[PDB]
C-alpha cells in the first residue's frame, strides 16, 4: 500500500477554477454565527435523505461547531458556494484534519464531510468542481490524502459497513414510519420486546471527566490498534471529541462514559455516543443516538470480549433511553458484530462505504459477510467512525 501520486508543491494553482455563471467561491467562517446559521439552513433542507424521502439528517448548529472546529481545523477547508447577487449559500464541502493508520502506516489526512448542493442546482456536475477545489485548498496546506464515507457506491471502496438500529422508543418510531408493526403483532408486544432496565448494571460506570483524558487516550489507542484502518487519536482529539463542555456547549452533542474499577480505580472501559436528529419530512423529529468510540481492557486477553461488550452496550442503551433518544444506531465496524443481534439491534437498509483518496491499500473487512450480515470472523478491519 502507499500513496498513488506525489503532488508537486510547485504546480498547485493559487487560484480556483471557474464556476457556473452567477455563482462564486466563498470560504465559510463558522465562528461567525450568521454563517454557521447559513450552513445549517442549507443542510437542514438539502442534506442527506433516505430513499423514500421520509427523513433528512438534521445536524445541529452545536454539532456543526463540534464536527468542523476540531483540533487543527482551518477555515480554508470550510468551502462554500454563494450566489453572486443574492449572496445565498447554495453549496458546501468541508474537511477537518486528522491522522489515520492504514495497516500500520500513519497518514496525515483530511476527513471530507457535508458535501451539499441546493436541490435546485443538482445534476449540473458541480460536485466534481467542489471536490477539485477542496482538493486544491488541501494540497496548498501540505495535505495530499483524504478519507471519506458515503451512502453511495463510488470507485474502489476500502470497506462497506451496514447500519443497525436499536429501538428505544418503539412507539415513536412506529409513529413516524421508521419501525413497522410486524404482521401478527401488537404495539404492546413490540414495546415489551424493546423494554430496557431502568438502571445500568456495570460497576463503576460514570460520565467521563477531563481527568480521565490521559488514561482513556491510552486505552483507546491500544484498542483501535486492533483494526487495519483506524483513527490515530491525539490527546487534544480525545478532549475535543469525547468530553462534553457544558459551560460552553448548551446543546450537548457527545455523551461519554467510563468504567472506573471499583478496586484499582483505573478506568478499564469506556463508550460514547452522539446526538444526530432526523427531520421527519411531514411528529417532526427522530432523535437518534449514534454509537461512537469505545474501548475495553478485556479486548487484550476470550471470549470474555463479547460478554463485556454485552454489558457495556446494554448500559449504553439504558443511558441513551434515559436521555430521551428514540433509537440507538450502530454500524458493523469495530467489534460491533459481537453484540448487535443479541442486544436487539435490527438490520437497516443503510450502508456506509469507506474511501481513501490518493492512497492504495487492500480492501479491509467491514464486519459483514457476503450476505451483508454481521460476521465475527469479518471484524478487525474498520476502526474509524466518521460523522
Ligand atoms: C487531498 C484532499 C482531497 C479532498 C477531496 C477528497 C474527495 C472527497 C469526495 C467527496 C466526499 C463527500 C462525502 C459526503 O459528504 S457524503 C454526503 C453527500 N451529500 C448528500 O448526500 C446530500 C444530498 N445530496 C446532495 O447534496 C447532492 O446530491 C450531491 C452533492 C451529493 C451530488 O450532487 P449532484 O447530485 O447534483 O451531482 P453532480 O451533477 O453535481 O455531480 C455528479 C457526480 O458527483 C458524484 N457524486 C455523487 N455523490 C457523491 C458523493 N456522495 N461523494 C462523492 N461523489 C459523489 C457522482 O458519482 C457523479 O460523478 P460521476 O463521474 O458521474 O461523474
Ligand atoms: C432515520 C434516517 N434519516 N435519514 C436521513 C436516514 C437515511 C434514515 N434512515 S436510517 O437511520 O436507517 C439511515 C442512516 Cl442513520 C444513515 C444512512 C446513511 C447512508 C449513507 N451515508 C450516510 N451518511 C453520509 C456521510 N456521513 C455519514 C452519514 C448515512 C442511511 C440510512 Cl437509511
| Bind-site residues | 115-117, 123-127
Ligand 1 test: best mutation among 127, 136, 387, most atoms within 8 Å of CB? 127
Cell triple for 138 = 488541501
| Beta strands per DSSP E along 53-123 | 55-58, 78-83, 89-102, 105-117
Q: In a 10 Å sphere around its CB, with 0-12 CB exposed, 13-18 middle and 19+ buried, how is residue 178 labelled?
A: buried
By C-alpha distance, which of 68, 59, 60, 129 is closest to 98?
68
Q: Ligand 2 pocket: which residues have CB below 6 Å?
A: 48-50, 55-57, 149-151, 163, 178, 278, 286, 329, 348-350, 352
Which of ligand 2's atoms lies nearest the C-alpha of 352? 20
Ligand 1 atom 17, closest CA:
115
Q: In a 10 Å sphere around its CB, with 0-12 CB exposed, 13-18 middle and 19+ buried, how is residue 372 labelled?
A: middle
Ligand 2 atom 29, closest CA:
151
Distance CA 382, CA 378 (A): 10
Which of ligand 1's atoms lies nearest the C-alpha of 121? 36
Query: What is the bridge-based pairing of β-strands 89-102 and 78-83?
Result: antiparallel
Residue 181 is among the residues annotated as catalytic for this protein: no
Are the beta carbons of 300 and 333 closer than 8 angstroms? no
Q: Which domains does the chain have, with CATH numbers?
A: 1-144 (3.40.630.30), 145-387 (3.40.630.30)
The helix (run of H) or strand (run of E) holding residue 40 is helix 33-46
Q: Counting ligands in written order, which one lies closest to the CA of residue 127? A: 1
Q: Counting ligands in written order, which one lies closest to the CA of residue 177? A: 2
Distance CA 97, CA 107 (A): 11
Cell triple for 279 = 427531520
Ligand 2 atom 6, closest CA:
50
Distance CA 135, CA 353 (A): 20
Residue 353 CA to ligand 1 centre (angstroms): 13
Residue 129 CA to ligand 1 centre (angstroms): 10
Q: Cα 178 vs. chain centroid, distance in angstroms?
A: 20
Residue 313 CA to ligand 2 centre (angstroms): 21
Distance CA 123, CA 129 (A): 12
Determine how many CB atoms are found less than 10 A away from the CB of residue 88: 14
Are the beta carbons of 134 and 95 closer than 8 angstroms? yes
Task: Map grid coordinates 451539499 to a residue.
Answer: 116
Amino acid at each position: 500500500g502507499g500513496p498513488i501520486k506525489i503532488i508537486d508543491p510547485e504546480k498547485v494553482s493559487k487560484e480556483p477554477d471557474a464556476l457556473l455563471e452567477g455563482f462564486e467561491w466563498a470560504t465559510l467562517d463558522l465562528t461567525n454565527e450568521t454563517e454557521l446559521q447559513e450552513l445549517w439552513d442549507l443542510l437542514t433542507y438539502h442534506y442527506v435523505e433516505d430513499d423514500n424521502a421520509m427523513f433528512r439528517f438534521r445536524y445541529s448548529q452545536s454539532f456543526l461547531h463540534w464536527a468542523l472546529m476540531s483540533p487543527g481545523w482551518k477555515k480554508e477547508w470550510h468551502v462554500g458556494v454563494r450566489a453572486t447577487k443574492s449572496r445565498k449559500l447554495v453549496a458546501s464541502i468541508c474537511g477537518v484534519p486528522t491522522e489515520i493508520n492504514v495497516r500500520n502506516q500513519k497518514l496525515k489526512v483530511v476527513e471530507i464531510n457535508f458535501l451539499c448542493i441546493h436541490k435546485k442546482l443538482r445534476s449540473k456536475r458541480l460536485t466534481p468542481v467542489l471536490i477539485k477545489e477542496i482538493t486544491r485548498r488541501c494540497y496548498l496546506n501540505g495535505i495530499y490524502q483524504a478519507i471519506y464515507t458515503a451512502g453511495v457506491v463510488l470507485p474502489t471502496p476500502v470497506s462497506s459497513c451496514r447500519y443497525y438500529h436499536r429501538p428505544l422508543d418503539w412507539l415513536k418510531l412506529y409513529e413516524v414510519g421508521f419501525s413497522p408493526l410486524p404482521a401478527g403483532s401488537t404495539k404492546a408486544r413490540q414495546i415489551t420486546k424493546n423494554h430496557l432496565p431502568s438502571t445500568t448494571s456495570t460497576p463503576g460506570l460514570r460520565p467521563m471527566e477531563p481527568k480521565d483524558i490521559d488514561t482513556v487516550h491510552d486505552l483507546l489507542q491500544r484498542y483501535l490498534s486492533r483494526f487495519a484502518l483506524n483513527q490515530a487519536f491525539t490527546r487534544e482529539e480525545v478532549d475535543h471529541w469525547l468530553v462534553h463542555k457544558p459551560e460552553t456547549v448548551k446543546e450537548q452533542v457527545v455523551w461519554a462514559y467510563v468504567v472506573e474499577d471499583p478496586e484499582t480505580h483505573k478506568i478499564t472501559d469506556f463508550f460514547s455516543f452522539y446526538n444526530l436528529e432526523s427531520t421527519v419530512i411531514q411528529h417532526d423529529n427522530v432523535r437518534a443516538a449514534y454509537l461512537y468510540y469505545y474501548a475495553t481492557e478485556t479486548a487484550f486477553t476470550m471470549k470474555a470480549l463479547k460478554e463485556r461488550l454485552l454489558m457495556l452496550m446494554n448500559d449504553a442503551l439504558i443511558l441513551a433511553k434515559k436521555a430521551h433518544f428514540d433509537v440507538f444506531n450502530a454500524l458493523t465496524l469495530h467489534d460491533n458484530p459481537l453484540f448487535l443481534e443479541q442486544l436487539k439491534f435490527g438490520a437497516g437498509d443503510g450502508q456506509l462505504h469507506f474511501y481513501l483518496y490518493n492512497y492504495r491499500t487492500a480492501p479491509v473487512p467491514g464486519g459483514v459477510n457476503e450476505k451483508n450480515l454481521p460476521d465475527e470472523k469479518r471484524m478487525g478491519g474498520v476502526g474509524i467512525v466518521m460523522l
